[PDB]
């Protein structure tokens, strides 16, 4: 009786939101950006190849200086690379080799990683002893760690396969806030540029917008047909893009509270592993299971170019803070640095 | 390299590269095995001499100059197809089936089919274990095998009943290139390490023959 009545009210609320979104869907992003000229063909060459990982690379993250990056592989090694010289700055042996994510702190003093061990491990890069040591192991998730991002040296947000995201106080080792509401495994998260909000994509084919300070879900974005594997904020923080197993990328708007554009091709039938934006946000770069990275026109949903330099899945990618280059990690154990030429 | 500090930085990088190769060579000498099965199928005590080294439970032991790393993924209650590709480079899969549990028998059959026909385990061999065969023989007297398998029409003897269950699992394999090593074991059996070693040795030879170009 009471349960049946309540679940009917949820359907009415869902229709109310759907009608509300349809009311503000006056135009389409495709119609708005029809007049602007296309970006042309985007040609990028492999400037650097980072060799030394002996297993599948699962994650990479640039440092804020746009020169150092950290990559994680299931050879049980965290490696920090000097991308300008291809020098290895550090090699961090992981206690658990089943790593799925890695993060570089914006200060550059810490890196984080974690996987099927359900732990987010914090590593101190600047110690008086001259070696990288574990500074914190964040326990509390009951599923695998899928993504992690530093807010500062003391706070980090983690998403897990136990359907929850958490905000952690690194100094105390406790999760100050728990973000619940996803009905599937949360596979990725992206921080807003001001680090007041973050979006997460789960296996329920939905993207939720969370308030870091308040600790509740502000908005829920649906439209994908399969598990979301990747998510990335637009550079101004007013939009985000997702990548799913349905071979599509979608651009959702925070303020319009709905999808604006879909990035898919008939030839593309493989899942998407990673998404990132260029510095101006005009390009959306997505890594795919078909061993390729497709560069999309974010505004016009046109495939601008292809980065074909890997013999296995493109598992991760990232664009530097200065926008100079893009790194692609792959299951073939190599990292490549790409940019164009005049 | 031109700068004095860059030369020492390059030397540090080269020293790191050397240690990465040394670790990788020692890592490639281990036999990694993925342990799967029902919730209670005897996978916890599949080997007596093995010792543990919510998350993934890794168990390792050494048998006849070969190091085996057994990974139990039963603690991961999340979606399996989001992290099962992490074991794509596994030497073999150890699948445990309890013959004394008819309720979970059909659970194992559908679990076996997904793993056997998984897109990441096409060329991965399976070491099927049918545990509690002594309890199955004791319980086959009062409870016929037709209770769990209505289509079963063979004799109710223990030897044929156990063989029919084994043939059910091997029928799930649709790839001729995959080899399944079935074994009937008891609770008091103490040669499960030898069975794994014999099966892994056969798999290694097939891998070596591919490595030497004969295949």
């Amino acid at each position, epitope marked *: 009786s009471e349960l049946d009545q309540l679940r009917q009210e949820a359907e009415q609320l869902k229709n109310q939101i759907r009608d509300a979104r349809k009311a503000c869907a006056d135009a389409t992003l495709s119609q708005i950006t029809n007049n602007i000229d296309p970006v042309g063909r985007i040609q990028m060459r492999t400037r650097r190849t980072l060799r030394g990982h002996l297993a599948k690379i699962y994650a990479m993250h640039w440092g804020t200086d746009s020169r*150092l990056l950290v990559s994680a592989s299931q050879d049980g090694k965290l490696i920090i690379w000097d991308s300008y010289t291809t020098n290895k700055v550090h090699a961090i042996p992981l206690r658990s080799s089943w790593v799925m994510t890695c993060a570089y702190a914006p200060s550059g003093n810490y890196v984080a990683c974690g996987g099927l061990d359900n732990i987010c491990s914090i590593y101190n890069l600047k110690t*008086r002893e001259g070696n990288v040591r574990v500074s914190r192991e964040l326990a509390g998730h009951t599923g695998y760690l899928s993504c992690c991002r530093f807010l500062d040296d003391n706070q980090i947000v983690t998403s897990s396969g136990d359907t929850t995201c958490a905000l952690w106080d690194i100094e105390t080792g406790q999760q100050t806030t728990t973000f619940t509401g996803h009905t599937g495994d949360v596979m990725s998260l992206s921080l807003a540029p001001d680090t007041r909000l973050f979006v997460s994509g789960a296996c329920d084919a939905s993207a939720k917008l969370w308030d870091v300070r308040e600790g509740m879900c502000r908005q829920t974005f649906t439209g994908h047909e399969s598990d979301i594997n990747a998510i990335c904020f637009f550079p101004n923080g007013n939009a985000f893009a997702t990548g799913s197993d349905d071979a599509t990328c979608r651009l959702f708007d925070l303020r319009a509270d709905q999808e604006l554009m879909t990035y898919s091709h008939d030839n593309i039938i493989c899942g998407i592993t990673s998404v990132s934006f260029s510095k101006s946000g005009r390009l959306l770069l997505a890594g795919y299971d078909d061993f390729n990275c497709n560069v999309w026109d974010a505004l016009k949903a046109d495939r601008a170019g292809v980065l074909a330099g890997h013999d296995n899945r493109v598992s991760c990618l990232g664009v530097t803070d200065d926008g100079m280059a893009v790194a692609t990690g792959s299951w073939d154990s190599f990292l490549k640095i790409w940019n164009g030429s005049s | 390299t*031109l*700068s004095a*500090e860059e030369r*020492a*930085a390059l030397e540090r990088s080269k020293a790191i590269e050397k240690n990465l190769k040394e670790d990788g060579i020692s890592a490639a000498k281990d036999v990694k095995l993925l342990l799967l099965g029902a919730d209670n199928s005897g996978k916890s005590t599949i080997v007596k001499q093995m010792k543990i080294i919510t998350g993934i439970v890794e168990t390792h032991f050494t048998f006849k100059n070969l190091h085996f790393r057994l990974f139990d993924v039963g603690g991961q209650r999340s979606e399996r197809k989001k992290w099962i590709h992490c074991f794509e480079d596994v030497t073999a899969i150890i699948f445990c089936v309890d013959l004394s549990d008819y309720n979970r028998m059909h659970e194992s059959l559908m679990l076996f089919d997904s793993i056997c026909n998984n897109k990441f385990f096409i060329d991965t061999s399976i070491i099927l274990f049918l545990n509690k065969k002594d309890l199955f023989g004791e319980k086959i007297k009062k409870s016929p095998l037709t209770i769990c398998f209505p289509e079963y029409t063979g004799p109710n003897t223990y030897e044929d009943a156990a063989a029919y269950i084994q043939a059910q699992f091997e029928s799930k394999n649709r790839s001729p290139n995959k080899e399944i090593y079935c074994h009937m074991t008891c609770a008091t059996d103490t040669n499960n390490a030898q069975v794994i070693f014999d099966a892994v040795t056969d798999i290694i030879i097939a891998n070596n023959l591919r490595g030497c170009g004969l295949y």
Partner: single-chain antibody
Amino acid sequence: VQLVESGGGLVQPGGSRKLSCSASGFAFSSFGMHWVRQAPEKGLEWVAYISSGSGTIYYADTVKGRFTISRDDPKNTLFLQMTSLRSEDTAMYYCVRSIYYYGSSPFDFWGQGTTLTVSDIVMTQATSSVPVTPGESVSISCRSSKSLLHSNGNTYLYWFLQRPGQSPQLLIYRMSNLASGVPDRFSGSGSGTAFTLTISRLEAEDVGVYYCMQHLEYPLTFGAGTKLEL
């Protein structure tokens, strides 16, 4: 982090002496090691260098062929075998750790030193002494015969402070960066061959001799040193 030197003492001319540097509290095998000596009432003088992994070894010309530098990584001990000792070798010998990777701070920790008594880019610090008062801003100048700015953007100039009775401490590395544990009042500014160390709101602790060292190429050379007095 500790670096204790031993083996120094009064030796006869033409003799031999073995200096040891025991390291504790840090990953010794990860750090390159230098020997730097300081003659009594004189400035710092670099002696030798052994890299991490013992693959690269450098000597100063005044000691090359007579001194041998070696390390024992399992025992965390640094050695300096000296032969044919001359009266020019009478100095306090310091054990200095230095690690080299992108963004590292070489020469960050120095040992207490051991005293031995026997019976090239030019770095110039013309101002030998500077009278100072607490709370007032002070600038110290250093010059080099060659440009210390490399094509990679680094300017390999270092600043050290040796308080009376104490070992040198790193203040500024690569001409602008502030060493860990150093107050923000110190600031390093330079261009090409001319460099300035600015000390805003001088305090009692800042009193001492300041040395500028170049790390552009070997041999590493020190300036004469500028002393601050009240």
